[PDB]
Amino acid sequence: QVLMDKLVELAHQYKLKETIQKLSNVLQQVKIKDYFEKLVGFIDDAVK
Length: 48
What we know:
Blueprint: H1 2-14, H2 16-28, H3 32-47
């Protein structure tokens, strides 16, 4: 019981959820639509 409780406390000390959330927040701020437009332009150039 003590082992499990201390493991739970240690895991919650790091708070992996906060790190994942921060990474997700930064991920959205990149200009993704520019990349999508560039891909569309490449395929359009190929078709043309």
